[PDB]
Amino acid sequence: GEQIFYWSPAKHWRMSDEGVVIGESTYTGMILEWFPEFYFFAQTGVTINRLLERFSSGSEKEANEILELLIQDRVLVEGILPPREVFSPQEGLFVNPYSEQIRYSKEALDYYVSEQLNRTHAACRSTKIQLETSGALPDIIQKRRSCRRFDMKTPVSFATFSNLLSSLKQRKEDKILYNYASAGGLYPIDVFVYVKPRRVEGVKAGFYYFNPADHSLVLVNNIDQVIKDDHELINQDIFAQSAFSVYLVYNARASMPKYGAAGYFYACIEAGIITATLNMVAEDLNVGLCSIGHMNFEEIQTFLKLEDHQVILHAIEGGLKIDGAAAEN
Amino acid sequence: GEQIFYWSPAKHWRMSDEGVVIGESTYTGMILEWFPEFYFFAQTGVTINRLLERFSSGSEKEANEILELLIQDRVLVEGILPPREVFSPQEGLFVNPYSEQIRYSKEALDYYVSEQLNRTHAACRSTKIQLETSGALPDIIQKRRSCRRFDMKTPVSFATFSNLLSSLKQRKEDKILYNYASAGGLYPIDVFVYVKPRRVEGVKAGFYYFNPADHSLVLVNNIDQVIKDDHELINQDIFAQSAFSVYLVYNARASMPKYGAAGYFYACIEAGIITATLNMVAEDLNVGLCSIGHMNFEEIQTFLKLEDHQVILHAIEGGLKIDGAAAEN
Amino acid sequence: AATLHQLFIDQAQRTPDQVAVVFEQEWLTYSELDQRSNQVARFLQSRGIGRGDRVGVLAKRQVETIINLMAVLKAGAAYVPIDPDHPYERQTYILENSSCKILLDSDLYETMEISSYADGDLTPVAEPEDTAYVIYTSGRPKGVIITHQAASNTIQDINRKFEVNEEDRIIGISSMCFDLSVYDIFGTLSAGATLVMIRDPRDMRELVRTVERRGITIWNTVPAIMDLALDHVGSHFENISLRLVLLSGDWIPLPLPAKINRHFPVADVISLGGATEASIWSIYWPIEQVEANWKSIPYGKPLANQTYYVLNYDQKMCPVGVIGDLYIGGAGLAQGYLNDDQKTKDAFIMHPEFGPIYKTGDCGRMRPEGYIEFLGRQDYVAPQAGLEKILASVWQEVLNVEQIGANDHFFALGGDSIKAIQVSARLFVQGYHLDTKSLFEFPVLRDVARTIKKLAAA
Ligand SMILES: *P(=O)(O)OCC(C)(C)[C@@H](O)C(=O)NCCC(=O)NCCS[C@@H](CS(=O)(=O)NC[C@H]1O[C@@H](n2cnc3c(N)ncnc32)[C@H](O)[C@@H]1O)[C@@H](N)CS
Ligand SMILES: Cc1cc2nc3c(=O)[nH]c(=O)nc-3n(C[C@H](O)[C@H](O)[C@H](O)COP(=O)(O)O)c2cc1C
Ligand SMILES: Cc1cc2nc3c(=O)[nH]c(=O)nc-3n(C[C@H](O)[C@H](O)[C@H](O)COP(=O)(O)O)c2cc1C
């Protein structure tokens, strides 16, 4: 009945004269005597109570303060890590040959980009095969663009919204089938949608879980809502205009029992497969989409009532494309 | 001029009575005195020579043996980790409620799958909106299947092969554009192809780097070749029949200077975007494709002469679809 | 309108899947609240709790408190709310003075395994003439006996005059030891609306975020809460979810409707107040825009089923106005004070030409425009840093002083709760956007300065 916490794989450590270095912070007080044994103990999975019995030796108020902070600072966690924590140690392994001003200066970035778009692999030989551009590509692939401004008046028709979301549904035909691929055919991505008021015909505002087996939306949360402060500054106008928000969620229980940790990796790939699949059906239906890399997923995860085995990988904003005005409603 | 090695983020540790536990192995000998300070020293990046000067104190042959083994066992690494090492610590965080026999028994798996395909999110309310299947989906999306047997006689026409690979090329139009999305428009995935002899009109066997700016293949390696023992048993007949192999490679230098570690995550998503985009152009051209999750990427990475900042994320086998026989050539 | 718990049961059958009450991460639907209140009501009856009894409840900001309250009413007994932050000696006084049998806290449904009791309907016990709750005021404190018939009349007319329905969402700011909360709990439920509970009522910044995050539509507080909250609000803020503002308690400042109209341009703000000694409310007067500005805001007309009088020394109506004492009558009147006959005989009296009346003690006059105006009631060293000086200056203007020691407790100058928020509000406005609470937990002037400045905006 007690919660079991594990040491986060994303956190690396060191002992110090100052105190216990964990991540980018130095800690002081009781935690100095508990350590380093506490590190060893914590990878195995331990409760708050067991930790207190083993380390308290004194004020249980003094012991609870350090335990409360290690959980808050995400050194002790209750379930699978979100992607951003998974990849965080990689910064210490990548040697950056450019200046930081690429991120702070539009002029430094515009140059870094043009250099990366004309890059080649260094181990290339002096032979070439010029192919042929003569081919024709489907317009749904070649004309897809990221839409960051939407028609905020015309509601998405119930037929249009149903068609877009039918790209993700099941198909019974001697065996369950989707319209997109999935490592091992396990399809461990839960699909959620947030709909804004009056922006999708037939769908009241709120968070819904899309059940691909029924082809139905099932309400999760109509009380809370997504706001602009949940989004990065550069994306707040994208969200403001959009009719709905898609959230791609990895269900570890639908994957990891078979493929282990690689199933989490496969679901990140599958998220892109879903994203790209979506953006084509959208172009067929004159719906625009734009992928969102980061946003306050800690809040969205809470709104959707996700369990310990679910983490949000990706978000997409969507809506009808501009072409004509309408009566303001 | 010396190589700098870092402690692998994928490796966690503990001190022991037996010796130094690193990963799933216990180590003995000199390494016991060097530790734990060696751990602290190694996250910062250290050479073999500097390590010897600091820890040798004795037989430089005895010091080199332990250093050679920590590099071999991937505790000390020279560059970014491949996806499989990135995600490996996640096994200790996922509590599996099923039995291991899902992986060993076709009957246990067939049941686990059907349970995961009829799953729902647990926090669902008792409201429902039945949508509409009445829509029509493009055949290129709805009819794509994973093709694991190919026409091994009819060569892929040079026009067909050029059209498939034109999905990944650049488009100059006031600004460089692709036919697929990329976080920050940085497009950090290098695309490589291995072509089998006589299976693609106009393309001699060998490893090529696809340059999207020229729309050209540039040879990397015609000496080596991919063989069936480089593939998992369940995939060897897929590879045997295929005309070519696609390899999706993350170029950290084209991404991480801007987005940090999240750019590695974004490239995994982008790999799926590319994979899915490819599998549709293929269906338009009656080419079949099948994604490959794992394979001996350590060898392929070596054949392609990848640098420290490049790792292989994904592989795809491709070829013409069966429909009619031909003269054996 | 029968009883309070019967209005909830009837509506819970209409919209069983509608959210009944939300706190933070777990909330109860109308069917869930009905099932768990039935289970606890049966548990109370197993302890001999029935008609005529009184049950003490702790007013913690948790959804379990809503279950206990509804379960006490379903058992036929009245509930007496107890403030958990009150000292033990004051909590004990009310419990013994009210003759309560037991005290219900949040440790009950899980502690007593009440999930095993029956969750079905219970054949009714309480009648509209029965006592629904006794609430103590003026802490020494005196309890007010409100019946079910009385509490339902106030609630039924608010919801029907303002069309409260399922789409409404009420923010639960007022503590349950104050009679205002009864509308936030029972008035919300009788219309199928949702109640959002607030963890800390003096966290003005959280109150603002809660209104925007959860689409709050109804605001029902003392006007002091709205005026203090809008002083933690930027000049470019605007919300369109709030549609009804019910203000009552203490005076109603003139600059406040200007703030309410500019930040909530769609909110129908209503100036009211009805004395706890009656059903909570008794007067109804919407801000009818503003075509009149002088020095005071008028009270209004009787809400419904209630009457108002400006009486002289022989209990006769003052002509064409005439400032005098204020009396009320009607279905909202309480039964009396619990176990105090002297105060009951003086406050609740019989009118020579009309039904019973209650003496509010307030003074006022009937304007020729038909509304009654409220005319009052009772007749008879040096800082060590630039930041410390700025913080002292705010203490100086709010508490009206000159120079203070940094170690002078914030209330050495008489500082209370309302002035504590006023201090941090002015600190918030000038660019110290941090902890606007923590004014009594940190006596030192500097300790507050280290807590309010730095970081701030972003
Ligand atoms: P700190 O931690 O202590 O800070 C928090 C505090 C307690 C300061 C603050 O958060 C707070 O007050 N919180 C409690 C919530 C709340 O609103 N409590 C007030 C009780 S509501 C109840 C009061 S009453 O009207 O019955 N009082 C009766 C009496 O008041 C006079 N009166 C009220 N409104 C009037 C108007 N508009 N005009 C003239 N007089 C008014 C009358 O004399 C009346 O008889 C209300 N809601 C029920 S009526
Ligand atoms: C993972 C991901 C995240 C993105 N996030 C944003 C974003 O936050 N804001 C934005 O304006 N565009 C965003 N984009 C859009 C692309 O970075 C880029 O602008 C464009 O999609 C490249 O091709 P396109 O312009 O044809 O769409 C994102 C794309 C991807 C793949
Ligand atoms: C990342 C990934 C790896 C896959 N690896 C294999 C594989 O090794 N062998 C195989 O037969 N199919 C493989 N597949 C195919 C799918 O797991 C699955 O069989 C099929 O694609 C599901 O839809 P489809 O049958 O319509 O293609 C892979 C798919 C993905 C997405």
Query: If you ran DSSP here, which 8-state letter would residue B322 be given?
Result: P
Bridge partners of B27, per DSSP, are B20
* Host H or E run for residue C190: none
Closest-CA residue to C152 (of C279, C12, C302): C279
Residue from A117, A146, A228 to probe ligand 2 pocket by mutation (most atoms less than 8 Å from CB):
A146
Q: From CA C169, how far away is CA C211, in angstroms rounded?
A: 9
Task: Say whether C311 sits in a helix, a strand or coil.
Answer: strand
Residues of B in contact with C17 (CB under 8 A): 125-127
Q: Is the CB of A183 under 6 A from ligand 3?
A: yes
Structure tokens at C394: 């705010």
Closest-CA residue to A316 (of A279, A278, A285, A290): A290
How many other CB atoms are there within 10 angstroms of residue C24's CB atom? Answer: 13
Q: Which residue has the tokens 């073999």?
A: B48
Q: Using a CB–CB cutoff of 8 Å, tell me whether B246 touches chain A.
A: no
| Torsion region of B172: left, alpha or beta (phi above 0 gives left; psi -120 to 50 gives alpha) | beta
Residue nearest to atom 8 of ligand 1 (CA): C417
Structure tokens at C132: 């629904």
Sequence length of chain B is 329
Ligand that comes closest to the CA of residue C377:
1
Chains sharing 3 or more CB pairs under 8 A with chain C: A, B
Q: From CA A269, how far away is CA B189, in angstroms rounded?
A: 13
Task: Say whether B83 sits in a helix, a strand or coil.
Answer: helix
How many other CB atoms are there within 10 angstroms of residue B278's CB atom? Answer: 23
Residue pair B251/B307 in contact (Cβ under 8 Å)? The answer is no
Residues of A in contact with B101 (CB under 8 A): none
A312 to chain B, closest Cα gap in Å? 13
Query: What is the C-alpha R_g of chain C?
Result: 23
Q: Using a CB–CB cutoff of 8 Å, tell me whether C205 touches chain A.
A: no
Query: What is the C-alpha R_g of chain A?
Result: 24
Resolution of the deposited coordinates, in angstroms?
Answer: 3.8
CB contact under 8 A, A223 and C19: yes
Residues of A in contact with C238 (CB under 8 A): none
Residue pair B88/B22 in contact (Cβ under 8 Å)? The answer is no
Is beta strand C54-58 parallel, antiparallel or unpaired with respect to C78-82? parallel
Q: Is the bond preceding A36 in cis, omega lying within 30 degrees of 0?
A: yes
- Cα B265 to averaged position of ligand 2 atoms, centre (Å): 14
- Which ligand 1 atom is at minimum distance from the Cα of C221? 17
Residue nearest to atom 6 of ligand 3 (CA): B292
| Mutation for C interface: A219, A223, A229, most C CBs within 10 A | A223
Closest-CA residue to A260 (of A80, A47, A67, A91): A80
Residue pair B125/A218 in contact (Cβ under 8 Å)? The answer is yes
Measuring CA to CA, how many Å separate A53 from each of A29, A48, A210, C453?
17, 9, 45, 39
* Host H or E run for residue C33: helix C30-46
Q: Using a CB–CB cutoff of 8 Å, tell me whether A169 touches chain B.
A: yes
How many other CB atoms are there within 10 angstroms of residue C47's CB atom? Answer: 12
Closest-CA residue to A198 (of A248, A235, A252, A155): A155
Residue pair C155/C145 in contact (Cβ under 8 Å)? The answer is no
| Torsion region of A118: left, alpha or beta (phi above 0 gives left; psi -120 to 50 gives alpha) | alpha
Q: What is the DSSP string of A178-189?
A: -SS--GGG---E
Query: If you ran DSSP here, which 8-state letter would residue C185 be given?
Result: I
Ligand that comes closest to the CA of residue B181:
2
Residue pair C425/C231 in contact (Cβ under 8 Å)? The answer is yes
Beta strands in C319-409 (DSSP E): 324-330, 336-337, 348-351, 354-366, 372-374
Q: From CA A242, how far away is CA A234, in angstroms rounded?
A: 14
Residue nearest to atom 3 of ligand 3 (CA): B293
Q: Which residue blocks in C292-444 are alpha helix, DSSP H?
A: 341-347, 386-399, 417-430
- Which ligand 3 atom is at minimum distance from the Cα of B314? 1
Residue from A167, A170, A176, A182 to probe ligand 3 pocket by mutation (most atoms less than 8 Å from CB):
A182
Is beta strand A25-27 parallel, antiparallel or unpaired with respect to A76-77? unpaired
Query: If you ran DSSP here, which 8-state letter would residue A74 be given?
Result: T
Query: If you ran DSSP here, which 8-state letter would residue B218 be given?
Result: E
Chain centroid to CA B232 = 14
- Which ligand 1 atom is at minimum distance from the Cα of C178? 20
| Mutation for A interface: C213, C214, C237, C238, most A CBs within 10 A | C213
| Torsion region of C367: left, alpha or beta (phi above 0 gives left; psi -120 to 50 gives alpha) | beta
Q: What is the DSSP string of C142-171?
A: EEEEEEHHHHHHHHHHHHHHTT--TT-EEE
Residue pair A43/A7 in contact (Cβ under 8 Å)? The answer is yes
Quick one: closest CA in B to C16, which residue? Answer: B126
Residue from A290, A313, A317 to probe ligand 2 pocket by mutation (most atoms less than 8 Å from CB):
A290
Identity of the residue numbered B260: G
Structure tokens at C153: 């009349």
Residue nearest to atom 3 of ligand 1 (CA): C417
Q: From CA C26, how far away is CA C28, in angstroms rounded?
A: 7
Q: Is the CB of B269 under 6 A from ligand 2?
A: yes
